[PDB]
């Protein structure tokens, strides 16, 4: 209880932690706090004391902090509210990195959420470097989107997606992703094309699987089991063979499951004989 100093304050330093909450309000010029933001995280203020520092920053920058101040927020980012962050114009990848790094392992809060929304809206795209930075901190990020959003990310951005990121994608997401990978990759030749496109084939059509078979590509069993079903179904026993290359023997091992049972059943039992392998099922005489 009061409203003046006795001594004021002109440096933001270890002395401040001994102030009472109002003394801080009385003695710290907000414009000074802003100007020495790069050293607040070194001073072990108490969290209630941080509240009064945050408030001061609001006074000074009432329509949103400048990136001059955001950069050095450090752990103060934990005290922002999404309305706070919605006023910002963060445009350096590095600043973003800095802010993500503070809640690194946590379930994306509304704060980092709005932060990320602000950042992308304000580049117009997910470009690529942006997507790199994001899957570095939130791996399931691309598949955390929703086919509406995914239709907007430009094929340029696809080079930043690593296959293990597609693990949590469901087929309606791959439906919009695969045509994007197709564009991102036409400059590739053959064995190089396949190694890139592989993860995206869960949304490919038969027209495109067929064309792959006619290449040398030596598709692994794991990726074949992720193929469509509707796309594998019209594949001739000859085509599936040339596709799986030296991995054909998997078929008997996945005789029961996924798109293979379905693919067996639609085949002339006198064709499955050509495979060695000894596949049971499918249509006789």
């Amino acid at each position, epitope marked *: 209880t009061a409203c003046p100093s006795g001594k004021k304050a002109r440096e933001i330093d270890e002395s401040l932690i001994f102030y009472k909450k109002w003394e801080l309000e009385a003695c710290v010029d907000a414009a000074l706090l802003a100007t020495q933001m790069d050293r607040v995280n070194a001073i072990p203020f*108490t969290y209630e004391q941080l509240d009064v520092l945050k408030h001061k920053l609001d006074e000074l920058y009432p329509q949103g902090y400048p990136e001059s101040v955001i950069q050095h927020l450090g752990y103060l980012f934990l005290k922002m509210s999404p309305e706070d962050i919605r006023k910002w114009n963060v445009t350096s990848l590095e600043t973003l990195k*800095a802010l993500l790094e503070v809640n690194k392992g946590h379930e994306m809060s509304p704060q980092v959420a709005t932060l990320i929304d602000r950042f992308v809206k304000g580049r117009g795209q997910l470009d690529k470097d942006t997507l790199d930075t994001l899957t570095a901190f939130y791996p399931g990020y691309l598949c955390s989107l929703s086919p509406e959003e995914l239709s907007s990310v430009p094929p340029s951005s696809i080079w930043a997606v690593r296959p293990q990121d597609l693990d949590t994608c469901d087929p309606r997401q791959l439906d919009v992703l695969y045509p994007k990978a197709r564009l991102a990759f036409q400059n590739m030749n053959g064995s190089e094309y396949f190694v890139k496109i592989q993860s995206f084939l869960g949304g490919a059509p038969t027209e495109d699987l067929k064309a792959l078979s006619q290449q040398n590509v030596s598709m692994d069993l794991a990726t074949f089991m992720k193929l469509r079903t509707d796309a594998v179904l019209p594949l001739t026993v000859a085509e599936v063979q040339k596709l799986l290359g030296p991995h054909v023997e998997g078929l008997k091992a996945e005789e029961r499951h996924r798109p293979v049972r379905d693919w067996i059943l639609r085949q002339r039992q006198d064709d499955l004989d050509t495979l060695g392998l000894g596949l049971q099922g499918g249509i006789p005489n």
Partner: nanobody
Amino acid sequence: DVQLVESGGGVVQPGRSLRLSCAASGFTFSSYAMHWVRQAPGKGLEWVSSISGNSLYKYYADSVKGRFTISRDDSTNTLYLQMNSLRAEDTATYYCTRHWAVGNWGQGTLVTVS
């Protein structure tokens, strides 16, 4: 994955010197202020010293001001604390962390399995 490793501890004649180090890995080092904290046997956690992320601003608790000095090599991602004129009250386990605030811990309770 973010890890921090402390080293340099040992037993020392009261008045000598001894330098600690903290090997940081897994986080952009320059983008964190960095703290030394110590727990004296039977007591709580005590703030000892801190250095800003850009190596420009160092800070010291009173109990240690003038005798200890904190450093930070951004190249090798290690944090240092040079302790000079060691008193006996300096005896503790010294930890390095990337964040401190003064009053966040209770006193404790003892649970005894027999």
